[PDB]
């Protein structure tokens, strides 16, 4: 068992429930050993509507979440849905989600 | 180690056509292999003295009246379950590239051997 | 176009689906002739009752 198949299993389980549409789009978050990414996706035509990235680091993650919220408000997205994307909802994931909540992104 | 066979083109297909061809004391045959397309033709039972024969007799130089001439080997023969007559023949066209696979009789330590048309790739025959 | 179908054999001992096909064609008597457009549906009925009819 490697981290790739572990995270693929978790991703499949989460995508079992979560899905995004033209309203209420999916909010994927990528975390690496350094930097972080966030992406807002419509899972019908496979079109991403907004994104943010990094380009401690809890502040960096919160700034990334606030930037994603700013992009969502610029593009006109009120409600979203957020998927764990293979990561336990704790640490940087929790901080980014809290920052996106403190911004717009009514979810 | 070189046979000569003649054939005539086949047009109709299906079980009715095959029954008519076999009632005229003939065998449907197909030649395929290499690149490009293949051909479907008619062989005669009397014209065949190849499969009912002790040695390999490969390199069946074929002349079909609907096309040119070729060289091939016995690839598949279909027999009747009861009368044990031939009902269908399939030929593998042989080219100088990608040497063919053959089965060659053994002696005692000697074989028939093959180098022209088929460079290599023998398997066995009557290993006992 | 128009084709003529004539019943030449009896419907006795024929299955009910064939009897109903004869009715749908409009043949109720022996040596009866009906005239129909040669549509694929009509041709299918004629195919179903081919052993009882003649194209005249």
């Amino acid at each position: 068992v490697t981290k790739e198949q572990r995270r693929q299993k978790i991703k499949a389980r989460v995508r079992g429930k979560i899905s995004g549409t033209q309203e209420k789009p999916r909010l994927t978050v990528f975390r690496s050993n350094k930097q972080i990414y966030a992406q807002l996706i419509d899972d019908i035509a496979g079109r991403t509507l907004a994104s943010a990235s990094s380009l401690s680091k809890k502040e960096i993650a919160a700034k990334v979440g606030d930037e994603i919220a700013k992009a969502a408000t610029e593009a006109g997205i009120s409600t979203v849905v957020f998927d764990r994307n293979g990561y336990l909802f704790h640490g940087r994931i929790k901080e980014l989600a809290d920052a996106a909540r403190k911004g717009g992104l009514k979810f | 180690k070189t046979f000569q066979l003649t054939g005539t083109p086949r047009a109709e297909f299906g079980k009715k056509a095959a029954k008519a061809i076999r009632k005229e004391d003939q065998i449907p045959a197909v030649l395929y292999g290499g690149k490009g397309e293949g051909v479907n033709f008619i062989v005669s039972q009397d014209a065949v003295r190849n499969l009912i024969y002790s040695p390999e007799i490969f390199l069946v130089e074929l002349t079909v009246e609907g096309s040119g001439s070729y060289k091939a080997i016995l690839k598949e023969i279909q027999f009747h379950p009861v009368t044990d007559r031939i009902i269908h023949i399939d030929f593998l066209q042989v080219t100088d590239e990608k040497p063919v696979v053959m089965e060659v009789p053994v002696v005692l330590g000697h074989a028939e051997g093959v180098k022209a048309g088929g460079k290599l790739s023998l398997e066995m025959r009557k290993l006992k | 176009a128009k084709i003529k179908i004539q019943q030449v054999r009896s419907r006795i001992r024929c299955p009910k689906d064939q009897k109903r096909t004869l009715d749908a064609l409009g043949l109720r008597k022996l040596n009866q002739i009906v005239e129909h457009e040669a549509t694929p549906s009509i041709l299918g009925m004629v195919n179903k009752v081919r052993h009882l009819v003649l194209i005249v």
Partner: protein, 141 residues
């Protein structure tokens, strides 16, 4: 007896032999053989009698193969037993065969008396047979 040591079910429905054999109709492993021209059930007693007949001849050279195995159980009712009330007493095993199926085959033997040994075997069977030879065999051994 020639029969399996175990079977999942002790009983079997009498099937229906339908057409010609599409497998086991060509001669592998050997040179001469006999094919059946009819559809029938073949008992182990008949098989053993035929093999004993074919092996009393031919001395002990060559090799003999039987290519059918009896694995279908059959029953019989009995004397004074009326119809109904389930299946009867077991009565052995049979092999169902169709036309074109090779029963017996021989190898390593001259043709002229292989033709006689196989006929001796075929006279102890309830089916009409046909002698077959390999389609590569030559007269000079």
């Amino acid at each position: 007896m020639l029969q399996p040591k175990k079977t999942k079910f002790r009983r079997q429905q009498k099937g229906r032999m339908k057409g010609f054999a599409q497998r086991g109709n060509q001669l592998s492993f050997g040179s001469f053989g006999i094919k059946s021209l009819q559809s029938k059930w073949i008992t182990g007693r008949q098989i053993e009698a035929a093999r004993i007949a074919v092996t009393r001849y031919m001395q002990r050279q060559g090799q003999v193969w039987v290519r059918i195995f009896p694995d279908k159980p059959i029953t019989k009712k009995g004397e004074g037993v009326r119809m109904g009330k389930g299946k009867g007493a077991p009565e052995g095993f049979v092999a169902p065969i169709t036309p074109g199926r090779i029963i017996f085959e021989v190898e390593g033997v001259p043709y002229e008396i292989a033709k006689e040994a196989l006929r001796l075997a075929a006279q102890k069977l309830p089916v009409t047979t046909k002698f077959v030879v390999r389609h590569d065999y030559d007269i000079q051994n």
